[PDB]
């Protein structure tokens, strides 16, 4: 399972922003125009227009992935090993061989 982590958005209050080029997993960044956002005080900015926002998102491994994860493998020619118990007359012998 991936944890889709979303960094806290940033706003250039009366300017402009450009999407950078990070190297996170499935990194996705977009820039939106004037938003004029509210948090708790009825206003976050002073320009009703040209008030861009940067929306940022990517993915990481979930915290519980250390147990619930799948490992992908490729296989090649397989060697067969056998343990043999062999008895002749009085003597028995255990031996592991390829």
């Amino acid at each position: 399972r991936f944890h889709t982590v979303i960094p806290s958005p940033q706003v250039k209050c009366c300017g402009s922003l450009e999407c950078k080029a990070s190297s996170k997993a499935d990194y996705t960044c977009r820039v939106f125009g004037g938003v004029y956002p509210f948090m708790w005080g009825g206003a976050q900015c002073f320009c009703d227009s040209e008030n861009t926002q940067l929306s940022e998102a990517y993915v990481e491994f979930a915290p519980d992935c250390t147990i619930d994860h799948a490992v992908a493998l490729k296989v090649h020619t397989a060697a067969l090993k056998v343990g043999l118990r062999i008895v002749y007359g009085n003597t028995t012998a255990h031996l592991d061989t390829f």
């Binding site: 889709t4 996170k24 939106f32 998102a57 990517y58 296989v75």
Partner: protein
């Protein structure tokens, strides 16, 4: 996206994680600050639901699958040609038997 191995890494602690989950960001419409986004479901869960029975219940020839390392124990198939040098000490001559 939406299928097994949509997020991949060399190890759990590896920082070079690569994924393609079809995540897309939308324009924020509500007045309050919030970042919207829609993303394809986790393909890991999709495979988990549709995994099917494991190889412990499907391997033929009565082969008991095991891990750490991957192996198949007590597997009954075929014939093994064996050439064995039995020592002459154990042999007993017919004059005494």
């Amino acid at each position: 996206p939406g299928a097994f191995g949509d997020i991949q890494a060399s190890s759990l602690d590896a920082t070079d994680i690569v994924a393609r989950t079809d995540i897309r960001l939308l324009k924020p419409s509500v007045k309050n600050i919030h970042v919207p986004y829609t993303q394809a479901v986790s393909g890991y869960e999709m495979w988990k639901n549709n995994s099917g029975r494991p190889l412990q219940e499907t391997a033929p020839f009565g082969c008991k699958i095991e891990v750490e390392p991957l192996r198949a124990s007590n597997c009954a198939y075929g014939h093994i040609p064996i050439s064995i040098d039995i020592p002459d000490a154990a042999f007993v001559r017919s004059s005494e038997s």
